[PDB]
Amino acid sequence: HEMRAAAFSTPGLENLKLVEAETPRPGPGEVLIRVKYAGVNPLDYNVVAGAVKASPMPHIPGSEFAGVVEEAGPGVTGVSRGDPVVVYNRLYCGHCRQCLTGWTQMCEVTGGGIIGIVTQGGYAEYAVVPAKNAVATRALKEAATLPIGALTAWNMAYRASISPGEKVAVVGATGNVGIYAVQFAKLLGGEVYAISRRKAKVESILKSAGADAVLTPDEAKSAAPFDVVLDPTGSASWDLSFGVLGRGGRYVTAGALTGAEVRLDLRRLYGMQILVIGATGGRRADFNTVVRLLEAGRIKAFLHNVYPLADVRKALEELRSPERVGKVLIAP
Amino acid sequence: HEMRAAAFSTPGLENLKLVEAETPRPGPGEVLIRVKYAGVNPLDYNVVAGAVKASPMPHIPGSEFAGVVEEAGPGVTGVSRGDPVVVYNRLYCGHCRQCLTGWTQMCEVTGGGIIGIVTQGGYAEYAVVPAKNAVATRADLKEAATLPIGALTAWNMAYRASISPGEKVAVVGATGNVGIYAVQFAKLLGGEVYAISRRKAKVESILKSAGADAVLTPDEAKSAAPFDVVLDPTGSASWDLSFGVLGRGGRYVTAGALTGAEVRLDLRRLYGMQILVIGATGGRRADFNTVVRLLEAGRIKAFLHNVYPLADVRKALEELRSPERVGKVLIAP
Amino acid sequence: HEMRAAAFSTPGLENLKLVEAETPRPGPGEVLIRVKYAGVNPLDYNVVAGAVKASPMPHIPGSEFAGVVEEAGPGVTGVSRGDPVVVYNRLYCGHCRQCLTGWTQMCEVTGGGIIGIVTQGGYAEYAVVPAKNAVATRADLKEAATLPIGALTAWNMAYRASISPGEKVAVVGATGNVGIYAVQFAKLLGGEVYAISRRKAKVESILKSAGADAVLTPDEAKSAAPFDVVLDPTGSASWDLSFGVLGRGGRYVTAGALTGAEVRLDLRRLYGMQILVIGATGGRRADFNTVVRLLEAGRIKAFLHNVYPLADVRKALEELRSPERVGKVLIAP
Amino acid sequence: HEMRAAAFSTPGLENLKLVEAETPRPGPGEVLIRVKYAGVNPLDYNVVAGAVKASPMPHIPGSEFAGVVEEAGPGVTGVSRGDPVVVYNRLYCGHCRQCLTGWTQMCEVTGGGIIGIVTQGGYAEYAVVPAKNAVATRADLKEAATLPIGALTAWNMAYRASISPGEKVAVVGATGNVGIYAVQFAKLLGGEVYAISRRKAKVESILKSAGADAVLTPDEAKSAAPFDVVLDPTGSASWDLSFGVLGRGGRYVTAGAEVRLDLRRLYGMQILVIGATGGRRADFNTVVRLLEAGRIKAFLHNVYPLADVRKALEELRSPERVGKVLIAP
Ligand SMILES: [Cl-]
Ligand SMILES: [Cl-]
Ligand SMILES: [Cl-]
Ligand SMILES: [Zn+2]
Ligand SMILES: [Zn+2]
Ligand SMILES: [Zn+2]
Ligand SMILES: [Zn+2]
């Protein structure tokens, strides 16, 4: 059996090519999934561009996908052929200190290894994952926005300890993570201030996602202080995100694995009793929660475009586009 | 120098009389409030029935009220005459361990003393309260008058339940004043909210409009179990059903109105399921400010039923006992 | 091929039953719509109850709905599969004296015929309507489904009342589906808007957020008289309390839901005060587009009470008469 | 007794002198008002500049004012000493075809004569006006003094424009005294209001707080077209808007000022070009009530004492003025 796939033998977007590949077969504890939709994320871009080493080489990227189970590996029970599933993207052992306390994305054994980075991912017709990573859902186009976009945002909001009344600023609120951070900050009862430079073009979308106000970076300085800043853009908005925080403010940062180094004002940190909280991925337990919330309609998938596998390079480049407002998906 | 008020020299609903009393005067750290609206709650009823002892005697009840500052006593800054305010109803010292950790309703010096139970209350044209308890508000005062007991109690129950988004929250007594706010807060916190009511045939849609995702009779609630959280402001009435529907790690939060009750608690089920049985009363002084701002922002909603003049206080207490419809009963002096 | 639908073969609320029925197919100039939301209105109640004759029989009611275009029939253009639409509910020919002057609800060829009364309606998964009656909208379809009766009727009443800024406009039945939008349009045209309601405490906040400057009981409205305009969407229910509040040159704009509505008019008061009694029904096809555009812009608001599934259609229709109800009841097939 | 007043004997701001004058006495049908606030408008500037003849001479200008009734003339009833009032500025006879149909500003007997132009006006401690022109008000007289010209002229333009909810209304010169109320009335009537300004950054927030849905420069407005209504308080829209910005059935209303007009475009688009001036006496009562109810708002820039009347008038032309200038005698 042969399948279509987007693969690169050397990093660089220019080397990402449509190829024909041996359709993998699921081993013990694994399932084979017919990928229906895969997300296009800064992480996928950075994998292809070479900012993070991938395996195997040549490499099929794509760390966020949903599809239908094609074959269950020997001794696999719990999910079976025909089941629509969405895939939690971290490999985890289930027996180390981190997995047993819920932080599967910190697994000491797998290093937090990401499907589509340390294994072949979803920019292909078929992919093999662990069966325990595959979550049956009745939601697949919307579900394919969950493994990175929604789950990362949930994990940030969870780690910020937002409480009703608290002023929450979301930097990068039009990005895949930020759009779900707006939603989760509102669902936890926050007063939600969404920040984008394109406020005029995007204000309707962001309020639809739960924002109480949309602000440019310079206006947010005037709306300070905030009790929480959710900043999924890494080091990119560090200067603005730290200075708008009030007493006891929580700055939650996540990122897409690219170089990020900043200058921390210790005097302000200790004087204001601010917390700078790292977040990455999400817990395996909370992925089930995010899937159920999508099924219940309590969170929403904001889609910009769906592209065939053959347009994967243009889809990746559309992450940079000022006209893009929402998620870009690939459909093998 | 004189004011109208409702008062009783001895307990009993029959003994609640419209009188003329000496208009009280604010001392230092106090304000005098022209009462615009006072809530009618189970607590007030039980004070007038004698189920809870009041002081002084004879007694003006009314522990939930809003109005306009008429006079500021010595040393008072930050409120002036004309200010519409809604009154936090727990006296608190600010210096004990409970106050200093924010549990001002547990003050060790005042014993949690409730305005209108250990002081004269708001069933009167005027009342005196500490200035630090009077919160300035731009909300309509009829709606503000639902906050000191109804909303704040419900908030404090929901806060003590550590509700996480997605968790299933059942609210028992969801048509009552506390319960209808418990539905709103459970939803505001991301819960999936199931309002339980024997009257679902009549109250289903009003409870949906308060934020419930579904409304269930008790028999349907058994089939919808398990729940992660049960909020029960009605004390001992619903105990076996509220406790039986809880899942692993479930939290049962109970509040009451100082009527005595006892339940039979199966500790084996409690420890086998790692359930928590959590008492809640009143709310935190800091959280009352938050509740006031949430009303002003329209993030929660005051469900009102009828306003009665002071002279119909007996009719008003009766309407609490057998309501024509769901919502808060107010007294307007 | 088969769809679920609420239908009745003889009138009476007890005979409205969930059935399976042939999915209808769109003939020329017609579209098939997957109904997302249908309004529950007094008009739908009166059709099911027998006050109005429906065709065909057995009959699927529901004159107010929005949804997603599923199939376009022969000859249809500019309306494609998946387009969310809300349905103008009057059948019109486009060529008679009434249609050509804009009064499409007065069409002389179709007789003003209302979709879901003279055709099968929206209390089903699918309904076929004329393509030109389907208005594309980017509004949430839950909100859009409050427009074809509630907002459009209200708009048409306010428009025919010649309201000018400053004028005192009383809206009776102000919490009904039409009334709540009539508050909004009277205010949008510049009126000083008095919402008249006897349950004033319960509905004041919602009516003020719809744009009422004040909320008065009917007896307070007698004391606040004179008014320049009464918007009255309740048939004959309010006439005997409200007609007397109009001053000189006042306009009494009457609409209703097709039940008997005979009243006694004092011709002497009418001619002595130069009052106009102005009939209003439905609205103009052109104005429906405007009302849809105003909802998309946020200039008018849909005030929802609850959404029921199609199986609960009898409960939804009876909730229309509930003392508990404030706001729109929707059916979601 | 004597009063302070600004008067001129020959035209020109530099000839507007502070003098002492006999306080006038109210005759039949008149009241004496102690002026509290008087507006500064282009009309007062042009009267003082000599562009409009005035009487009597020497002349006290000031056509927009509010104050307190000090004395009622013989036989006057209805309004009483001590009443705060704001003055409708058109003399009207009450008996001709215009007055009887409500167009008092068109009165055929008085010629539309304006108080402070054909009578001594409000830039003085006291002024005499007809009793029927004084409207009692519970509004702050500071804000009331913005109504007889600013608010009323704008109301009359929006009235004559037949604005329907949803119509797109462009207001030219939107920071002017009339323009800023025109923004408000266009919004109060349901319009979608585009305020046009060359000073867009300086005034955007002020125009939004007056009810403008957008603030545009003249070149940005070319793209927002077409408009159903163009309100042009000063007759200057031809410098900021091509006649082509008006849509089908479009209405252009001007309350001030020769221009060149494509008749073919006018009849082909069924456009209306509509003149407006002052306001109807009945509508003045309505404007006063809307201010009292907070439904329209007075945007003030500065208040000057009567001694600074020359600076107040000249401030009408300052590029730094955003809002109304008042004199307080
Ligand atoms: Cl992104
Ligand atoms: Cl209704
Ligand atoms: Cl000006
Ligand atoms: Zn592990
Ligand atoms: Zn204490
Ligand atoms: Zn016709
Ligand atoms: Zn005349």
From TrEMBL, chain A:
Binding-site positions, Zn(2+): C93, C96, C99, C107
Enoyl reductase (ER) domain: residues covered: 12-330
Superkingdom per UniProt: Archaea
Keywords carried by this UniProt record: Carbohydrate metabolism, Metal-binding, NADP, Nucleotide-binding, Oxidoreductase, Zinc
One term of GO molecular function: adenyl nucleotide binding
Single Gene Ontology BP annotation: protein tetramerization
Positions contributing to NADPH binding: R90, T152, T174, N176, V177, S196, R197, R198, A254, A256, L257, T280, G281, R324
InterPro entries recorded: ADH-like_C (IPR013149), ADH-like_N (IPR013154), ER (IPR020843), GroES-like_sf (IPR011032), NAD(P)-bd_dom_sf (IPR036291), Zn_alcohol_dh (IPR050129)
CDD domains: Zn_ADH_like2
Protein name: Alcohol dehydrogenase (Zinc)
UniProtKB/TrEMBL annotation, chain D:
Chain sites annotated for binding NADPH: R90, T153, T175, N177, V178, S197, R198, R199, A255, A257, T277, G278, R321
Single biological process term from Gene Ontology: protein tetramerization
Pfam families the record matches: ADH_N (PF08240), ADH_zinc_N (PF00107)
Cited Gene3D superfamilies: Medium-chain alcohol dehydrogenases, catalytic domain, NAD(P)-binding Rossmann-like Domain
Binding site for Zn(2+): C93, C96, C99, C107
Organism in which the protein naturally occurs: Pyrobaculum aerophilum (strain ATCC 51768 / DSM 7523 / JCM 9630 / CIP 104966 / NBRC 100827 / IM2)
Keywords annotated in UniProt: Carbohydrate metabolism, Metal-binding, NADP, Nucleotide-binding, Oxidoreductase, Zinc
Domain Enoyl reductase (ER): 12-327
Keyword Magnesium: no
CDD domains, A to Z: Zn_ADH_like2
Protein name: Alcohol dehydrogenase (Zinc)
An annotated Gene Ontology molecular function: metal ion binding
SMART domains the record matches: PKS_ER
Keyword check for Cell cycle: no
